[PDB]
């Protein structure tokens, strides 16, 4: 038997329907415990699943020079084996040795892009404020009532209550006029309300121009440079991961201010465990972001709600390869199996099935959607049932 | 439709009174979070501010309607609009306003001589309406100078007594127009 | 004895320098290659002897004949002793030549020229609101049109299906009309409708001026996936090279498909060289794609006329090796030399001067605004030409009616 | 010996530690000034222990004691051997106490906190247009309908001066009017009014737009002739500083006004320390703006809450030397430390690390638009009621005047 | 005697009204000769002005280590003695002793900033082109015509040409209708002018949203920063200078990112003399910047048209200083004449006096200017001139 | 008044058929730099583009309105447009229309009988004007597809010819409501 150390991270790991039901092995069920089990049968040998105390990639420590979770069970020999998603680091290469990549890898992007927000009806409604509206409507009723009580001041003038009503509702819509003030008194309150719906109309277009002209400027992530420029945007990586230590180390003069500014951010940007990382990102609402590896921002896309996305593409090449302590008697079987198992394609297969069974979701005009001026139409169609409503009141009134 | 109109002027022009006092009286004007007490859920009022769920529980303190400001003067547009806002002057003189119609329309019953009684009524009551939109307007803006805010109960009164304030003035003209119509001819 | 370099001419890897023809030896060819090369050079202790294979295809094996050519092709006959040319790591590659770790990794991506806003097309007027918008103002105009003609009819207070139909027209091109719905019934219809009008010309407005405002221009293909689908732009590979074969035997069903199209397309979208890639794309203006490694994308893109960019995610990262014969003696000091030079990270000092600090574009990225032209307002000019000319022809039909 | 150092806590050159008071000795102090002190006892070979002087002001003397206070004051007793303060290099100083060539040097800058675009004012929707043109439009308005009148009743085809009157308030407001001109000389005035008014209210449409897309904020006193004109915010300096010496002693006319106003100001302008006028500035929220050399304007805006910003162009360059007794053993070795310590570029990295790498503010720079606030537009509403008002008045007026 | 070279820059060195009539000292008339005379005064050593043959500032070779213009006649010792605006650099300060500064000096940046441009009348034609404009009125001409043809096609309609054209005109400025088409065949040319009219308003109203909005958001150069980030703008130094060989040894990141730009700019930014960086920036009207010292540019300033200004301020503290070789005899008297000039206030009195002389020059809106709208009120007027001058032309037919 | 109609009426068709006829024919319809000749000062003509002071000096060339482009088919917009700028056939049915306009109103003369003579010559007239207007937009929209493009005389007089052919256009109608007026009562 030998005790392989894995992270508990879906869909590498994932925990088994009853965790209390299901005990060693059958607790855990995932695409590397399936792995595992290829493994243990082509190399003939015996493997215990647990999960490292540690729980982490794995650290450096540049004071002790000792390594942490996966990495520091190997080194210290406690764990016979790694069978997990470690990236095959120059750093970890020196310490404990790496059988030839499993899977592919790169750094990639999580951020909740894809949120789809609907418009909601009444939006159109949202360049003037509410009270606005509440006011524009008491100002409505306000002059109608004053027009009235001006036009009947003195006894003998066709402006009654309801056609001063339509009158008023005719200037702000700005469409028609039935019917034109003649006295003084009138022509004040209708040049005065003309004034009114002239500032506000054009209030409301110009405002209107602005929302639509911000949410036409802004351009959402698109590159890692993006990224690094703007301050607003949080990217946030593993507190302690392969990245973590590639970041740090970085040459790269972009990644090396990307990696700065990291320890720079406040709050820290630096996430234990993915879940946290995952929770920050969509109570953020891309006010941070996630840098993880591609394969588990792939999972995380296919799996329900798929709120996270990719931006760009990975930014460095990487491997995931099985890690036994430096001249181990283990390593040569399975860095064999790697090269065995990859060409029986029964690894490629479980991949495959892992990502598409679990996947729920498998296009942009800057032009206003129906969507978008929905509420105008509900209130047309609903005015017109009203009318006919109303033109049959009208008609039983007639008849009696 | 012509005797009922003018029991329903007076009938209303009560009930709107009674909506603005009411309204003015009432602290429930506004639901907001405020420092006061300890971001604190409070329904500030028109004249007093209660608190709720905060440092104390129905505690209610005068509002500071002169806090320590940029423009402050005798003669400065962030004084005067704050001036106006603390004596509540337009709220008041709506009041008033409807008082003194409600008064007006009682006068035209027993003095059926003068036509220009219930004149006065209506104008008054579209005054005391116009007056309502300015004490609405002023006290928006100046609760202006994101918290979320949502207007409470004593507002929406205020908001109706205002659509009852124009109601019975376009009564009060159609009641003028009937009895000088009468003198007519 | 000197090592041959087998190295492609393909900049910024390989440059020709301006008076190169001048020059004698390695001085010819100046770039981050030669640079590299000379590092290599330097921690093998061993001279070295710049070369370019006739071909210029790093790797080019016939299936019947299963022979190698270019870069592969000098390491089989034995001619060229090591190869700094970026050669692809690719398994069949692997087994038949000898790979140190790869001093740069990059994906597959795609090379297409940029989005041109020119020629407005006839109809642009229509372009703020969506084409359902616009037919549903149509299925609206109609409703509200017969609701205000069946209320006038059903309660009277005339409004006829056709002084109906006029008095919406107007009302929605904010014309004053001189009938006007006197009914509450019919009041209600109007009051509703000139809402509705008021906030869509106000929409129209705004969303047109935000498309003046802001120029986005649509990338043709935004994805692999979307460019297989739609098929609109071309899309080719190096004749013979690592992208050519990657595809060929991909496993994916889309990458399959795009593979068997460009072999069964004529005619060939497979390009001989880099450069006759890139230029079949300018001639192309975008009826023909290219895909090819990110960094190659990368620094065309940075090379005048800043027209060729780098659209979606890259369709799988590769590395680049030095290349050696199967089991050569230089090939342990070139792999010591790549690690020693990647921790002293020589090799990424020299790709940043060489892919960004050149500076060819400077990265160029609110210009002033250009007053419309005719062009842009066309189609309302023909569609004002056109009702004129229907006018005209009713009005001679109800002429020849009037008649008879 | 051990060589005192007077170095003023001011940050970034000093800062006090989080665990300044668990720490002892030099540890207490870590800053710019400290690294450069630490740099400048290495080249010098001497054992340097970190001071503050008890007042806090780099220089202090009164004209009738002519006797130095601060770091001066410990160079002039001698209890202080060397000075890592920033120290302006003024000639008076320069007699008085030996003066290394300057480390840094940085103009005098003004420190005034960010401008607010809060509180729209009542009559802000007149914003877009200029007051001129609002005067133009009324003295238009007047013209046309006085035009139209006289038109009409010389050539008539009825328009009276109070209808001419309405019909071009009505054309203006683009609210249709029954009354249309008939006679050709009418209805040129008429057509050329329409095209005036189509112009002006699509112009203000147009430009409220751009306000309300774009938001830039004036700065109150954009230079320093400026402020000294308006004399709206009151400026300040150290009480006792190098920047209070030179405003008096200066020669410059506008500059001598700013210096005998600010001594000659009730309550005092001048401040005690720098922490006391950046507090100051924020208590005022711009009725007092601050002058202070760009080098603490800079680490301020970088701290939070980066409200204080810097404006204008420096009003003189000073440069900060070590200073050193007069005649000082010292005073060789640091000049010489400086020198190499320039050539170096080690002073330059360490101001780089402190002034920006920091990234307290990280320097935030098109947010979402918010919808207008009933403030926004409340001038309206009160012409609107106020409108109303004199209707009412103007009917009861002829009321009254129909009685008798 | 002592040869003093002296580049000819102005204010420093004028060349005199009539170049052949003046010779020797008497040739120049500047701030720097009066200068020079007032040493040559104080030390009681005759002088005598020439212009080097290089008239460069100075340069660094770094293959011979060799100086030239000014510095290199000194290095040479040809020339005894330098009076002039040079810069005191430590690379200077090494190769030839530099006297106590008579003035400070600051690398400033000079661009034509203040065109100050007018909007013109007729200006508020520009958001649609011309083209447009005029098929505005062929198709007002056309419309009118059709209406008028449709109306009167078949025999009895209150549509004249003259009604027509003015409820076409009335139409397209949306202000009013007169009288409405009645017929089918009237109905569809309304129906498709008001579609035309709609679309045209709103597009001129869109656009013209569009201009004000871009010229609202373009930020005028505030920062050396500023400069360096937009590639549009391209900041040039003299070829051969103290600020050209500051920006070079600069350890700065943002002017050592300036510094490389400059070498990596096409065409070459470096300008060979004064003159051709002040021409080049009016050519280029802002397209490209001058960086040169405060002092020169506070002179241009000075000097009609006033056309380049300042940006920020000056970048850095520089004096000029007198330049002799080291350890000349000549620089113990110069370095003392530098204090006794400077205490007399002579020195200082001569700055001032050929500034404030030579001075010919000694405030934004965004809100629309009565300029910028100009053109229509123009327009009104002369409509109005035109009604009154046809309503005496019908005044005088009704007559007769 | 009347009769005076008919002669300017006439008179006018044939100007204004002439006016079209010359701007046609003539090659000065727009003033341009062209790479044809050496960023060349070309005056371009609706049919023929004729270079000034480049590699030649007077050399007329036929144009070329299908270069190589990106859209191009037997139902394109791209093409379609080009096909209609190449044919010129508005600018010419204009021209068709005013000459058959110039028969018609001879016609009207010879018959007095057929009222419709004359209304068939203004409908033709009004037509012929829309043609041109249409004929103007289809050139400038192809032109465009900042070099400085002056429209020299050549075009002017195809916008003097629409004017022309607006009025005589009127002046047909006007007969036509005459004669049937005439013929009414
Ligand atoms: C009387 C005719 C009125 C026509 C109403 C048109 C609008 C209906 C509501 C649309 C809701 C928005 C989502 C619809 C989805 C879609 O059709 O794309
Ligand atoms: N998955 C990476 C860690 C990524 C991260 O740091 O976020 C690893 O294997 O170490
Ligand atoms: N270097 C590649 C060819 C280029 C490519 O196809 O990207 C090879 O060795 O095949
Ligand atoms: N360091 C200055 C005081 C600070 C200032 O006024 O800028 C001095 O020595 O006087
Ligand atoms: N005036 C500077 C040169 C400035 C520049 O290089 O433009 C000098 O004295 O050298």
């Given at each position: 038997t030998?005790?392989?150390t894995?992270?508990?991270?879906?869909?590498y790991?994932?925990?088994?329907?009853?965790?209390?039901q299901?005990?060693?092995?059958?607790?855990?069920?995932?695409?590397?415990?399936?792995?595992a089990?290829?493994?243990?049968?082509?190399?003939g040998?015996?493997?215990?699943?647990?999960?490292?105390?540690?729980?982490?990639y794995?650290?450096?420590?540049?004071?002790?020079?000792?390594?942490?979770?996966?990495?520091?069970?190997?080194?210290?020999g406690?764990?016979?084996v790694?069978?997990?998603?470690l990236?095959?680091?120059?750093?970890?290469?020196?310490?404990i040795?790496?059988?030839?990549?499993?899977?592919?890898?790169?750094?990639?992007?999580?951020?909740?892009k894809?949120?789809?927000?609907?418009?909601?009806?009444?939006?159109?409604?949202?360049?003037?404020?509410?009270?606005?509206?509440?006011?524009?409507v008491?100002?409505?009723?306000?002059?109608?009532?004053?027009?009235?009580?001006?036009?009947?001041?003195?006894?003998?003038?066709?402006?009654?209550?309801?056609?001063?009503?339509?009158?008023?509702?005719?200037?702000?819509?700005?469409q028609?006029?039935?019917?034109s003030?003649?006295?003084?008194?009138?022509?004040?309150?209708?040049?005065?309300?003309?004034?009114?719906?002239?500032?506000?109309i054009?209030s409301?277009?110009?405002?209107?121009?602005?929302?639509?002209?911000?949410?036409?400027?802004?351009?959402?992530?698109?590159?890692?440079?993006?990224?690094?420029?703007?301050?607003?945007?949080?990217?946030?990586?593993?507190?302690?991961?392969?990245?973590?230590?590639?970041?740090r180390?970085?040459?790269?003069?972009?990644?090396?201010?990307?990696?700065?500014?990291?320890?720079?951010?406040?709050?820290?940007?630096?996430?234990?465990?993915?879940?946290?990382?995952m929770?920050?990102?969509?109570?953020?609402?891309?006010?941070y972001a996630?840098?993880?590896?591609?394969?588990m921002?792939?999972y995380?896309?296919?799996?329900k709600?798929?709120?996270?996305?990719?931006?760009?593409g990975?930014?460095?090449?990487?491997?995931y390869?099985?890690?036994?302590?430096?001249?181990?008697?283990?390593?040569?079987?399975?860095?064999?199996?790697?090269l065995?198992?990859?060409?029986?394609?029964?690894?490629?297969?479980?991949?495959?099935?892992?990502?598409?069974?679990?996947?729920?979701?498998?296009?942009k005009?800057?032009?206003?959607?129906?969507?978008?001026?929905?509420?105008?139409?509900?209130?047309?169609?609903?005015?017109?049932?009203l009318?006919?409503?109303?033109?049959?009141?009208?008609?039983?009134?007639?008849?009696? | 439709?012509?005797?009922?109109?003018?029991l329903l002027?007076?009938?209303?022009?009560?009930?709107?009174?009674?909506?603005?006092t009411?309204?003015?009286?009432?602290d429930?004007?506004?639901?907001?979070?405020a420092?006061?007490?300890?971001?604190?859920?409070?329904?500030?009022?028109?004249?007093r501010?209660?608190?709720?769920?905060?440092?104390?529980?129905?505690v209610?303190?005068?509002?500071?309607?002169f806090p320590?400001?940029?423009?402050?003067?005798?003669?400065?547009?962030?004084?005067?609009?704050?001036?106006?806002?603390?004596?509540?002057?337009?709220?008041?003189?709506?009041?008033?306003?409807?008082?003194?119609?409600?008064?007006?329309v009682?006068?035209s019953?027993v003095?059926k001589?003068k036509?220009?009684?219930?004149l006065?009524?209506?104008?008054?009551?579209?005054?005391?309406?116009?007056?309502?939109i300015?004490?609405?307007?002023?006290?928006?803006?100046?609760?202006?100078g994101?918290?979320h805010?949502?207007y409470?109960?004593?507002?929406?009164?205020?908001?109706?007594?205002?659509?009852?304030?124009?109601?019975?003035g376009?009564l009060a003209?159609?009641?003028?127009?009937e009895?000088?119509?009468e003198?007519?001819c | 004895?000197?090592?041959?370099?087998?190295?492609?001419?393909?900049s910024?890897?390989?440059?020709?320098?301006?008076?190169?023809?001048?020059?004698?030896?390695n001085e010819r060819?100046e770039?981050?290659?030669?640079?590299?090369?000379?590092?290599?050079?330097?921690?093998?202790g061993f001279?070295?002897?710049?070369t370019?294979?006739?071909?210029?295809?790093?790797?080019?094996?016939?299936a019947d004949?299963?022979?190698?050519?270019?870069?592969?092709?000098?390491?089989?006959?034995?001619?060229?002793?090591?190869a700094?040319?970026?050669?692809?790591?690719?398994?069949?590659?692997?087994?038949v030549?000898?790979?140190?770790?790869?001093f740069?990794?990059?994906?597959?991506?795609?090379?297409?020229?940029?989005?041109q806003?020119?020629?407005?097309?006839?109809?642009?007027?229509?372009?703020?609101?969506?084409?359902?918008?616009?037919?549903?103002?149509?299925?609206?105009?109609?409703?509200?049109?017969?609701?205000?003609?069946?209320?006038?009819?059903?309660?009277?207070?005339?409004?006829?299906?056709?002084?109906?139909?006029?008095?919406?027209?107007?009302?929605?091109?904010?014309?004053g009309?001189?009938?006007?719905?006197?009914?509450?019934?019919?009041r209600?219809?109007?009051?509703?409708?000139?809402?509705?009008?008021?906030?869509?010309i106000?929409?129209?407005?705004?969303?047109?001026?935000?498309?003046?405002?802001?120029?986005?221009?649509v990338?043709?293909?935004?994805?692999?996936?979307?460019?297989?689908?739609?098929?609109?732009?071309?899309?080719?590979?190096?004749?013979?090279?690592?992208?050519?074969?990657?595809?060929?035997?991909?496993?994916?069903?889309?990458?399959?498909?795009?593979?068997?199209?460009?072999?069964?397309?004529?005619?060939?979208?497979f390009?001989?060289?880099?450069?006759?890639?890139?230029?079949?794309?300018?001639?192309?203006?975008?009826?023909?794609?290219?895909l090819?490694?990110?960094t190659?994308?990368?620094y065309?893109?940075?090379?005048?006329?800043?027209?060729?960019?780098?659209?979606g995610?890259?369709?799988?990262?590769?590395?680049?090796?030095?290349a050696?014969?199967?089991?050569?003696?230089?090939?342990?000091?070139?792999?010591?030399?790549?690690?020693?030079?990647s921790?002293?990270?020589?090799?990424?000092?020299?790709?940043?001067?060489?892919?960004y600090?050149?500076?060819?574009?400077?990265?160029?990225?609110?210009?002033?605004?250009?007053?419309?032209?005719?062009?842009?307002?066309?189609?309302?000019?023909?569609?004002?030409?056109?009702?004129?000319?229907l006018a005209?022809?009713?009005?001679?039909?109800?002429?020849?009616?009037?008649?008879?």
């Amino acid at each position: 038997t030998y005790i392989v150390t894995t992270i508990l991270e879906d869909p590498y790991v994932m925990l088994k329907k009853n965790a209390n039901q299901f005990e060693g092995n059958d607790r855990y069920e995932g695409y590397c415990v399936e792995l595992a089990a290829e493994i243990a049968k082509h190399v003939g040998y015996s493997y215990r699943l647990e999960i490292v105390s540690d729980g982490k990639y794995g650290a450096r420590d540049p004071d002790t020079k000792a390594w942490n979770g996966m990495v520091g069970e190997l080194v210290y020999g406690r764990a016979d084996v790694a069978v997990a998603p470690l990236t095959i680091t120059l750093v970890r290469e020196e310490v404990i040795d790496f059988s030839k990549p499993f899977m592919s890898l790169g750094i990639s992007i999580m951020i909740k892009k894809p949120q789809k927000s609907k418009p909601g009806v009444f939006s159109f409604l949202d360049p003037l404020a509410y009270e606005i509206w509440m006011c524009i409507v008491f100002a409505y009723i306000g002059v109608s009532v004053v027009l009235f009580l001006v036009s009947r001041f003195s006894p003998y003038n066709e402006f009654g209550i309801f056609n001063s009503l339509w009158f008023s509702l005719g200037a702000f819509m700005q469409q028609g006029c039935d019917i034109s003030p003649r006295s003084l008194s009138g022509r004040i309150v209708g040049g005065v309300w003309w004034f009114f719906t002239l500032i506000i109309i054009s209030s409301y277009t110009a405002n209107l121009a602005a929302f639509l002209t911000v949410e036409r400027m802004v351009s959402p992530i698109e590159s890692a440079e993006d990224l690094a420029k703007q301050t607003e945007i949080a990217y946030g990586t593993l507190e302690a991961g392969s990245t973590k230590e590639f970041f740090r180390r970085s040459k790269i003069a972009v990644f090396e201010k990307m990696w700065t500014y990291m320890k720079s951010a406040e709050p820290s940007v630096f996430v234990r465990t993915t879940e946290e990382g995952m929770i920050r990102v969509r109570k953020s609402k891309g006010k941070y972001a996630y840098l993880l590896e591609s394969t588990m921002n792939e999972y995380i896309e296919q799996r329900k709600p798929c709120d996270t996305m990719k931006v760009g593409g990975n930014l460095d090449s990487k491997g995931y390869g099985i890690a036994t302590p430096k001249g181990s008697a283990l390593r040569g079987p399975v860095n064999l199996a790697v090269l065995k198992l990859s060409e029986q394609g029964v690894l490629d297969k479980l991949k495959s099935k892992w990502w598409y069974d679990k996947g729920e979701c498998g296009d942009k005009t800057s032009a206003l959607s129906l969507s978008n001026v929905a509420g105008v139409f509900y209130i047309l169609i609903g005015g017109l049932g009203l009318a006919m409503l109303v033109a049959l009141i009208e008609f039983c009134y007639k008849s009696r | 439709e012509k005797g009922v109109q003018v029991l329903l002027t007076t009938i209303g022009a009560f009930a709107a009174f009674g909506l603005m006092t009411i309204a003015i009286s009432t602290d429930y004007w506004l639901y907001t979070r405020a420092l006061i007490c300890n971001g604190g859920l409070t329904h500030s009022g028109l004249w007093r501010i209660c608190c709720l769920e905060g440092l104390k529980r129905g505690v209610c303190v005068k509002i500071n309607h002169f806090p320590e400001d940029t423009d402050y003067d005798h003669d400065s547009a962030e004084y005067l609009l704050r001036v106006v806002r603390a004596s509540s002057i337009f709220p008041i003189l709506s009041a008033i306003l409807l008082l003194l119609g409600g008064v007006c329309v009682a006068a035209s019953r027993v003095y059926k001589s003068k036509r220009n009684i219930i004149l006065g009524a209506g104008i008054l009551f579209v005054a005391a309406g116009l007056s309502n939109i300015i004490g609405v307007i002023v006290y928006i803006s100046a609760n202006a100078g994101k918290n979320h805010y949502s207007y409470g109960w004593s507002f929406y009164f205020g908001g109706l007594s205002f659509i009852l304030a124009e109601v019975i003035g376009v009564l009060a003209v159609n009641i003028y127009i009937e009895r000088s119509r009468e003198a007519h001819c | 004895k000197t090592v041959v370099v087998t190295t492609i001419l393909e900049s910024p890897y390989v440059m020709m320098k301006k008076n190169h023809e001048m020059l004698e030896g390695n001085e010819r060819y100046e770039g981050y290659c030669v640079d590299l090369a000379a590092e290599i050079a330097k921690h093998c202790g061993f001279k070295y002897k710049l070369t370019i294979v006739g071909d210029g295809k790093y790797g080019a094996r016939d299936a019947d004949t299963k022979i190698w050519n270019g870069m592969v092709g000098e390491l089989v006959y034995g001619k060229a002793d090591i190869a700094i040319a970026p050669l692809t790591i690719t398994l069949v590659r692997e087994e038949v030549i000898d790979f140190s770790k790869p001093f740069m990794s990059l994906g597959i991506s795609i090379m297409i020229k940029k989005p041109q806003k020119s020629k407005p097309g006839v109809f642009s007027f229509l372009d703020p609101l969506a084409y359902e918008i616009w037919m549903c103002i149509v299925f609206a105009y109609i409703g509200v049109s017969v609701v205000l003609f069946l209320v006038s009819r059903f309660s009277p207070y005339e409004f006829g299906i056709f002084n109906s139909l006029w008095f919406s027209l107007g009302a929605f091109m904010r014309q004053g009309c001189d009938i006007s719905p006197r009914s509450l019934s019919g009041r209600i219809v109007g009051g509703v409708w000139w809402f509705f009008t008021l906030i869509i010309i106000s929409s129209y407005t705004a969303n047109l001026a935000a498309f003046l405002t802001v120029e986005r221009m649509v990338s043709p293909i935004e994805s692999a996936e979307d460019l297989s689908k739609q098929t609109e732009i071309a899309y080719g590979t190096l004749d013979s090279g690592s992208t050519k074969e990657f595809f060929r035997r991909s496993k994916i069903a889309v990458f399959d498909k795009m593979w068997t199209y460009m072999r069964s397309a004529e005619p060939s979208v497979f390009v001989r060289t880099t450069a006759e890639g890139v230029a079949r794309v300018r001639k192309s203006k975008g009826k023909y794609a290219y895909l090819l490694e990110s960094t190659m994308n990368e620094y065309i893109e940075q090379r005048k006329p800043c027209d060729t960019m780098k659209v979606g995610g890259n369709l799988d990262s590769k590395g680049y090796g030095i290349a050696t014969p199967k089991g050569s003696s230089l090939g342990t000091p070139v792999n010591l030399a790549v690690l020693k030079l990647s921790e002293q990270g020589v090799l990424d000092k020299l790709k940043n001067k060489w892919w960004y600090d050149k500076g060819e574009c400077g990265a160029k990225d609110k210009e002033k605004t250009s007053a419309l032209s005719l062009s842009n307002v066309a189609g309302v000019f023909y569609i004002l030409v056109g009702g004129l000319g229907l006018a005209m022809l009713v009005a001679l039909i109800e002429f020849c009616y009037k008649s008879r």
